[PDB]
Amino acid sequence: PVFSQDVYRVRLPEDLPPGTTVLRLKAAEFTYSFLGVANKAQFSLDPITGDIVTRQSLDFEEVEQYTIDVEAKDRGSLSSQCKVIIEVLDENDNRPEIIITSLSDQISEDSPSGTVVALFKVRDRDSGENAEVMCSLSGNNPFKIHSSSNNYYKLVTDSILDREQTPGYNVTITATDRGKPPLSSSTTITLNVADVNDNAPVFQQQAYLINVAENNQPGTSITQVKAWDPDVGSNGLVSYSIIASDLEPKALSSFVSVNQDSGVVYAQRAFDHEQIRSFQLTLQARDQGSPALSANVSMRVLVDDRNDNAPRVLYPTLEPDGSALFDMVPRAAEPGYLVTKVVAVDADSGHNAWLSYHVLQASDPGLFSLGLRTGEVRTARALSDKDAARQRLLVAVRDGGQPPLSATATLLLVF
Amino acid sequence: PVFSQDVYRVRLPEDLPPGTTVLRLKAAEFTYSFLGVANKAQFSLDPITGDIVTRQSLDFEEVEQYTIDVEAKDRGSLSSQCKVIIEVLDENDNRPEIIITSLSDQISEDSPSGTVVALFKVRDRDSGENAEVMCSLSGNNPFKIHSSSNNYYKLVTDSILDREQTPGYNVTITATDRGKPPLSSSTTITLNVADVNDNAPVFQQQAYLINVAENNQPGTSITQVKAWDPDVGSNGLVSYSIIASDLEPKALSSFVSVNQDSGVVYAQRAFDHEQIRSFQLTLQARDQGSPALSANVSMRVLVDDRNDNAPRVLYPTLEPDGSALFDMVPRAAEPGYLVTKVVAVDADSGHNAWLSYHVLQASDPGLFSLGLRTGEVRTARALSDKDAARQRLLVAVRDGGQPPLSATATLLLVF
Amino acid sequence: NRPVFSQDVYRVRLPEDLPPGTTVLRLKAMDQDEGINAEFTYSFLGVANKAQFSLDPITGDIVTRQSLDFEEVEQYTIDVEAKDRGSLSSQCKVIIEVLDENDNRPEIIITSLSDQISEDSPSGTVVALFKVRDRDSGENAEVMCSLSGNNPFKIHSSSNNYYKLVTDSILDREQTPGYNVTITATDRGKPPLSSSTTITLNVADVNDNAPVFQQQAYLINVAENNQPGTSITQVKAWDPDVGSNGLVSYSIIASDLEPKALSSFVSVNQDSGVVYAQRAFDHEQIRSFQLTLQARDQGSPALSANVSMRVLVDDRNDNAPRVLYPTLEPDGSALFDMVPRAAEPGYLVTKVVAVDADSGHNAWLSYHVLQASDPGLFSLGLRTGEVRTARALSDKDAARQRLLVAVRDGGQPPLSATATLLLVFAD
Amino acid sequence: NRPVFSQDVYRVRLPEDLPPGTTVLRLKAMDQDEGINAEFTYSFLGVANKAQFSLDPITGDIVTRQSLDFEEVEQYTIDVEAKDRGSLSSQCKVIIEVLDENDNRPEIIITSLSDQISEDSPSGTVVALFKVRDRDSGENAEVMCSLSGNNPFKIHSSSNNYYKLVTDSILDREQTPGYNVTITATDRGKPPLSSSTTITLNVADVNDNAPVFQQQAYLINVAENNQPGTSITQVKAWDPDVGSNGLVSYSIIASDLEPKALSSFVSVNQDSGVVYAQRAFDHEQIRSFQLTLQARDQGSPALSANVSMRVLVDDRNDNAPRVLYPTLEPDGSALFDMVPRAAEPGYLVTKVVAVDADSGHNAWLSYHVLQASDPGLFSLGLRTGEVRTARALSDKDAARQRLLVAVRDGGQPPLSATATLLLVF
């Protein structure tokens, strides 16, 4: 009972359907049978026709080689044996899988380029080129895939992160085997950037300025300040404070204060234009993070003048009644002769200190001419002897404000 | 020769296989033959057995029944006649056909519910219940199939259309017959919703406010506005204009304009802070569809102040060469004796109107003392006999803005 | 800002199975300057099948609203005009060409079918005319027809998709009465489509077979004096034909007998084929006789077959021996008184000669001595019958000797005839 | 101010196919005053799976980071702490529960497959053991197993997602030797997912068929005087069985002849079935005989079948006629004298009798005359054998006449027996 060959070899694709004849053993009254151990659950050997058949689906990942010992025996007890080595072939029927070994809690904004965000490995149950996989990262992300070792990868940053620009990212790792045809699978991880105090508060205006009218009730709003911080949380919350002033340090509390939460500037007293002209403060915005970032602005407050000071007369000296005595003016001079020079002042400024002398009353109209601005009282015409000796003048000093304030004086001039 | 019956009636499904025996005519050697006209291409009559078989597939849609006249003849002249009537039963072997007679060009979104959009009919080559056709539609789109008279249909609307939500629709009609088993066919049509000016323009900001520095060149851009419109075409093209202002209506053209195509606000004059401080304006954005829709926005323009106005000296009055004479100042004067107080104003605001008084030059340094803030020239010391009788004192008045504008004043002081 | 199209003429090629709702060409009229960007209004110009395609007047793209069909309409030509906010306008032409797809399977239409084919139909006889049609165009409409299986039929192509099913071999109904033939039509599209129709053909029978007798020659042996009108043997003829052409009829056409005798001796039942003897045969009269039988079918014309059967009659022991010489008196006695006393022993007294009309051992004669007054004085030849003297007679013997002889045959049981020889002496 | 959470425990339910990065929950702690609006900073407290969920310290919303899987972890627990700018704090607990989805289909595992099943195997034999596994839980792990086809198998479920492939009919290898069994498993979740595995089964042969002869009765004709050891005919028997149970062995068991003589008359070849003639048959010795043959297969238990074959020996003309009367001397002559010279016409001289041991044409005897001293004087019956006087004797004719008579048969070639008749007047 000779066999055609003493060793048979046959190559089977693992996707080979069940019930297909894989080998025919022909040596006519023979009976064939498995000798020794044979996976009879996978292959069937018809003892009459000598056909080996697959009874079940193959799987290269389960068992990849079989060795069958076939024994042929005739009607007489004649015997022969042969070996059939069935090699099954791998097919790319398994797709790659991604397993995330470690994922960072949060990545700080100031994490340098090259920091490792995530660790992950890949797997493919196939063998050879059907198991070699390529990991492509997807999208517009500041991330790069590094291969630490075979199927042990690293997700890392290669750019500089800025939470105020982009807070989060949707990274999707893709793994594609090099099999024919290829199979691929992907996973998606979300990454959030941790805030760091890398921005300092900045005031809306480089310098601030406000004019407030004098004679104001205290404890009221005079103006407001505001600072921006792109950071978030305690690193993006601003507080306002006064640190420096040209005023006496012990006297600053009496003038101004700042609401550290809102930034409105409170006046804590009734400003006086005549006592203090203006003052300069140094404001500071500041976050409550560690370390604390700050910014200083120069601010100035100019108190506006108001018509609250009546003019007062320096000369002549007034009796408590009001009159002044000048009883030696000579009749010898022609017009243009100055009798006296009235001088007054006003503690205000501008048109509130504009002095205009008016002849309010007189015992003789047209006798004395008074410079509206100079204050010199003169004789406008020649002295006629029909005029009386005793002459009473009543001058009024008025300021250029609206409404004006005035102060009157009596010039008793007799001849 | 006698038959069992004169007339035979059979029922054959149209899907009857070919070569199947239909009738067995028995009457003894006889010869059976077709008499008259008989579809010998469809049925075969064996002369010996008397059987009738189908030579070909049956089809109800072409022939519904056959009548064949068989004849039995003895060896002698004696013969007798028989008639066979074969009836074919209709089987559902035809699927329903959808034909679309008319399909609308465009349906405007303002079309009311129940408007006709498409016309289609259905046909079925079968017969009976195998030709009863039912039309079903997908429910996503707002369309309902209107069951018209007899296998005719209308596709109409059952909701409101909004092309700003969904501009188009895929519509899939599926017709199913009531045969057993049932057959079905489908068709797909695309419906586009037209645009109607049902949305109004929307300004990009709630209200506008821009700062314009004075002494600006005329014909320059100060700020730009934008208005959106989800409509498309002429219904979504915004045109800007100025509708009202707090200024004199005859002067509105002399101050600001707006480019209707771009929405930029042009300044038509050199703004002056000392004349007008700020002015508020109303803008209008409308689409060029008929009828049109519009929206109005508020925009306030603040004129920033610059140091363009020089401080004018009020008191005292100056000569053409800027001279002032205080000739009768007492020589026996106490330190701090108020020689005079200079009054000056500035038409600007803030730093540009913050006046300080300096001493530009003097005949005798240290003879007079001038306050920076109030500009009061006084005597620092008591006048010694070594001091001259006539003294020249050139003072200046400056403001705080950069660059400063100053007004000079030469002073003639005789004792 | 007047519009200009990229091309004056656009061309798009679409497969007919393109889904409804597919953007086919996004027209975008632009300005002559590259830096400037403009928006235009698009609209159909001339006559355009708006039921099939739609043109967005803002985005400018064309989209199909229904499923395309190459067999209904092959191409479209739609003109598009771009208009600005002003009145300036540009124009372009869009030609859409549908591409034929293999979406129709071949259709088989059996134009004419033969009523029936006789087995003697020559090779080249046409049995079926059919045509094939494919609604597709070009190669998706080119067809290949193939038959199915064993049947002796060949497809003969013709002019314009008309086909002929013809016979190539010779038909024999006794071999195969009918065939199931299935025609398959396949287009040379990628992928291809096929459709098949089955027809059934029955071969008609012609009387092409003459009956054959079961045996080349027939020989039957029957004993004589049989019962008349009884079966003696039976013949049978086979005919593979069917119907009237396979109906065998037997008859007697000739023999070596006289005509009237032939009717009285043998007959044959034409349906069964058995042959009957209408009289009791006699071996002494007739020894044997030759006959010729003919089997025929009932078709027109009839086909016959001749076979010669001859009958041999077997002999039985039905005739008793007859004594020819010497002559017998009604008593049964003969008288021979001329016997010489001086004759030597062994002298031939006389010889009894008998014959038998039978044959063989049934005519094989023996002569036995039934009785006698004197035993041992006469000895006869057992077969020759020569009764002569056995021993010389003493003078003391009686002058009158009586002999009683019997002649018998060799049959079972034997038959005999007796004779008395009276012999007296003288001088 | 103090933060207060709306609830001390939050419960959310997430399908396991929830995309990563979706907002699970937005925790918003608030101040107790309805009018007061405040904000707090949130943070994970205690143990928490920071890998699957992320918490924004400002918006206070928990969001998934990776994709969820019910088969791995079914629920998570989070301890969130809300704190204001001061030292006051509040805490709550979020219980996240994942809902199982039908994302895993059931797999078939053929535990054990029978090597081969004999066609006599009882109804209900177990051919295959297999189990079905589904990684899902709940009604997505309950599976219905149905096999396709007409095969005489049905699925008998076992205890715990173990299954048995058993028979429900009788098997017949001569009708169906193999089977393509396709098992389809379908879980009962919505939507359902199904799979299928195919196995092949071969039914073994059992000697259940007995051989049969090609003819019910056998009849054969052979001519006599044949050489010994010659093929006269051949018998053949078929066996639907295959192998040892389908190999026919021929033998002769019965016959009407003498049992000790049967061996010398006829034999049979056991392997081929040819019938050999063991001697030269004689038609005159035996006319016909009956054999009873037996075909048998070589299995346990062996099945047999007997057939009757009748052998008829056909007659050939091998025996010549023999002349009974008259007895002839070595001369081949017989003497009948003392014939009367005055013989009447038709006077019966003698009747010749002869026989032949053959049959039919070979035994049909005819009597002819080859030579004669005087033609026309004696007439011999062609069928009767009667030699008589044809004419009256003339005075010129001699008394001593001789007639050479031969007896012939109708065989091919014909045989004869001769005799010379000496007749004296």
Ligand SMILES: *[C@@H]1O[C@H](CO)[C@@H](O[C@@H]2O[C@H](CO)[C@@H](O[C@@H]3O[C@H](CO)[C@@H](O)[C@H](O)[C@@H]3O)[C@H](O)[C@H]2NC(C)=O)[C@H](O)[C@H]1NC(C)=O
């Ligand atoms: C009506 O149905 C048709 C077909 O079912 C729709 O056309 C298809 O629309 C989808 C989604 O817009 C397209 O997917 C896209 O494919 C392009 C290919 O370049 C790819 O770049 C995109 O990322 C996306 O995957 C699909 O291609 C398209 N089919 C064809 C043949 O163009 C149509 O949109 C439906 N119309 C309505 C109003 O529902």
Ligand SMILES: *[C@@H]1O[C@H](CO)[C@@H](O)[C@H](O)[C@H]1NC(C)=O
């Ligand atoms: C043709 O097929 C039918 C059905 O398969 C069968 O009944 C018939 O006997 C067949 N005819 C021939 C001649 O084989």
Ligand SMILES: *[C@@H]1O[C@H](CO)[C@@H](O)[C@H](O)[C@H]1NC(C)=O
């Ligand atoms: C089993 O199925 C295969 C594939 O369809 C087929 O080729 C084979 O003939 C089948 N085996 C049996 C015994 O039917």
Ligand SMILES: *[C@@H]1O[C@H](CO)[C@@H](O)[C@H](O)[C@H]1NC(C)=O
């Ligand atoms: C054949 O004969 C033998 C013995 O005579 C007997 O055992 C056997 O059953 C018989 N077989 C048949 C089929 O009659």
Ligand SMILES: *[C@H]1O[C@H](CO)[C@@H](O)[C@H](O)[C@@H]1O
């Ligand atoms: C190989 O040959 C065997 C014969 O037993 C078949 O069963 C099988 O399907 C393949 O054709």
Ligand SMILES: *[C@H]1O[C@H](CO)[C@@H](O)[C@H](O)[C@@H]1O
């Ligand atoms: C990876 O790539 C394959 C083809 O190579 C796709 O089928 C799969 O969906 C994934 O995109």
Ligand SMILES: *[C@H]1O[C@H](CO)[C@@H](O)[C@H](O)[C@@H]1O
């Ligand atoms: C990642 O991307 C693949 C395609 O590359 C998808 O199939 C998968 O679901 C995931 O979105």
Ligand SMILES: *[C@H]1O[C@H](CO)[C@@H](O)[C@H](O)[C@@H]1O
């Ligand atoms: C405080 O509040 C007043 C209004 O009361 C403002 O005018 C001021 O600028 C500051 O914001």
Ligand SMILES: *[C@H]1O[C@H](CO)[C@@H](O)[C@H](O)[C@@H]1O
């Ligand atoms: C100047 O004028 C005012 C106006 O009322 C007086 O009240 C004041 O006393 C002075 O005469």
Ligand SMILES: *[C@H]1O[C@H](CO)[C@@H](O)[C@H](O)[C@@H]1O
């Ligand atoms: C000047 O005149 C006013 C009245 O106008 C007095 O009230 C004042 O005291 C002074 O005499």
Ligand SMILES: *[C@H]1O[C@H](CO)[C@@H](O)[C@H](O)[C@@H]1O
């Ligand atoms: C009926 O009988 C006819 C002829 O007898 C067959 O050809 C046919 O297949 C059916 O069995």
Ligand SMILES: *[C@H]1O[C@H](CO)[C@@H](O)[C@H](O)[C@@H]1O
């Ligand atoms: C239309 O509907 C029928 C059942 O009514 C289906 O069998 C067919 O495939 C189509 O979906």
Ligand SMILES: *[C@H]1O[C@H](CO)[C@@H](O)[C@H](O)[C@@H]1O
């Ligand atoms: C429309 O829908 C039916 C099923 O309803 C399909 O069979 C057809 O091909 C088309 O897609």
Ligand SMILES: *[C@H]1O[C@H](CO)[C@@H](O)[C@H](O)[C@@H]1O
């Ligand atoms: C007009 O143009 C100026 C620049 O000249 C812009 O700054 C302004 O906002 C507007 O767009």
Ligand SMILES: *[C@H]1O[C@H](CO)[C@@H](O)[C@H](O)[C@@H]1O
């Ligand atoms: C007043 O002072 C300014 C300097 O601030 C000079 O530039 C000006 O000419 C005037 O003397």
Ligand SMILES: *[C@H]1O[C@H](CO)[C@@H](O)[C@H](O)[C@@H]1O
């Ligand atoms: C003050 O001085 C300036 C020169 O600096 C003169 O131009 C002016 O008129 C005034 O006398």
